[PDB]
Paper text:
Escherichia coli phage SU10 belongs to the genus Kuravirus from the class Caudoviricetes of phages with short non-contractile tails. Here we show that the virion of SU10 has a prolate head, containing genome and ejection proteins, and a tail, which is formed of portal, adaptor, nozzle, and tail needle proteins and decorated with long and short fibers. After binding to the host, SU10 tail, nozzle proteins, and short fibers re-arrange to form a nozzle that extends the tail.
The portal protein of SU10 can be divided into the wing, stem, clip, crown, and barrel domains. The wing domain is the largest, and is formed by eight helices and a β-sandwich containing two β-sheets of five and three antiparallel β-strands. The positively charged side-chains of Lys3 and Lys5 from the wing domain interact with the DNA that wraps around the portal complex. The two lysines are repeated twelve times in the portal complex, and thus form a high-avidity interface that is likely to bind DNA soon after the genome packaging is initiated. Anchoring the DNA end to the portal would influence the packaging of the genome into the head and its final structure. The tunnel loop from the wing domain narrows the portal channel of SU10 to 33 Å. However, the tunnel loops in the SU10 virion and genome release intermediate have the same structure, therefore it is likely that a different mechanism ensures the genome retention of SU10.
Author numbering:
A (entry chain A), B (entry chain A): 549 to 648
Write the structure that this text describes.
Amino acid sequence: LAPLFGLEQDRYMTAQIFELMGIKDTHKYLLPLEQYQPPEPSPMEILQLEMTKAQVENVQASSQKMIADAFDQRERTTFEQQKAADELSLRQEELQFKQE
Amino acid sequence: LAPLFGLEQDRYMTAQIFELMGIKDTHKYLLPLEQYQPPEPSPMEILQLEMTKAQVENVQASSQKMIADAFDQRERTTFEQQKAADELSLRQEELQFKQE
């Protein structure tokens, strides 16, 4: 039942209890809900959220690096195969030329 | 109800209790809210916040380094391909020249 029992209901119950005994409630720290404003977030939680975001971004970057290096290895293998074929062709051509 | 029950309300409640028994309250450590000022932050929390900021910045720098090295690998592969093509062209030209 916590979701239904919000701040306003708790304040109303406390005010009823006070009216039963403490007729006056606004005289002290107790603040009417009308003038209440949400607390300002603290820097600690903000920086913790930023650190979590940075960590998840780092995980994503690591995955991106994995895929990128896989692609780089594929490209390097293809280039090596092409260069080997070209070198073989050049060697055959030179051999034939010198034999002629 | 903690957000509504601020410092002023707590001080007012304590003052009411004292007036019920301890008519005089300002005679000792108790300080009127008018003259109260927020406590000065301690160096420990400041340096902890600085360390957290440094750590998140280091995470961001690690991500930047990952992307930068990925780009560097791409550029190196492109340069290697271009140099291989140029070397093949030069070898073919030299072979044709010497055969002629």
